């Protein structure tokens, strides 16, 4: 049921998402080991994900959560990086997309830093890198990330030591 619609680099919607990617790059404590050494991305394509059934599943849960939180969904736009990006756009998120050993428990993780999500694109800790060169810092191979609509509702605030 999923179709992908390309956005034009001349479209404001494209420029906004690119701006969100580029401005949320930061330095990482690992000096680039997991995600590579870069300050900016070369954006190759941005696509809208349209899927009626996945959308309705999302908005139905949003409504429950919103009502449980006194008419406040607490909805955000956040990055997600994963080796399973292709399965996610066709099937949606589920428990096999969870990070079992994550610091805040076993759930689906999302980031405000685009470069945080970039660290997971080839796997935990960047796996073994791009499939072709086995290079976590590959400047050649194409990477993919999602920018996702996320309902937080009543979010439990946990400070980390990072």
């Amino acid at each position: 049921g999923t179709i992908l619609i390309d956005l034009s680099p001349d479209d404001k919607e494209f420029q906004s998402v690119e701006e969100e990617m580029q401005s949320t790059v930061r330095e990482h404590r690992d000096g680039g080991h997991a995600g590579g050494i870069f300050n900016r991305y070369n954006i190759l394509k941005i696509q809208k994900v349209c899927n009626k059934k996945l959308w309705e599943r999302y908005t139905h849960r949003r409504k429950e959560v919103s009502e449980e939180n006194h008419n406040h969904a607490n909805e955000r736009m956040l990055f997600h990086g994963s080796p399973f990006v292709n399965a996610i756009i066709h099937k949606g998120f589920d428990e096999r997309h969870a990070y079992i050993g994550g610091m805040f428990g076993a759930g689906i993780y999302f980031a405000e830093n685009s470069s945080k999500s970039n660290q997971y694109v080839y796997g935990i800790g960047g796996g073994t890198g791009c499939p072709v060169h086995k290079d976590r810092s590959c400047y050649i191979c194409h990477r993919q990330l999602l920018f996702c609509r996320v309902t937080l509702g009543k979010s439990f605030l946990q400070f980390s030591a990072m």
């Binding site: 404590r29 954006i43 696509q47 805040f104 980031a111 937080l152 509702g153």
Partner: protein
């Protein structure tokens, strides 16, 4: 997949040491996220 903390729908993981590091978020239901945009990119080598 764990349940979210009692009375809560998600976790906000907020770095307390790196002041330049932004938040991370966890949900425990797949139906609480929709993958709106697919971004295809390369990282760029610094000059």
């Amino acid at each position: 997949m764990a349940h979210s903390p009692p009375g809560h729908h998600s976790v906000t993981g907020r770095p307390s040491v790196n002041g330049l590091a932004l938040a991370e978020y966890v949900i425990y239901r797949g139906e609480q996220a929709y993958p709106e945009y697919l971004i295809t990119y390369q990282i760029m080598r610094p000059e």
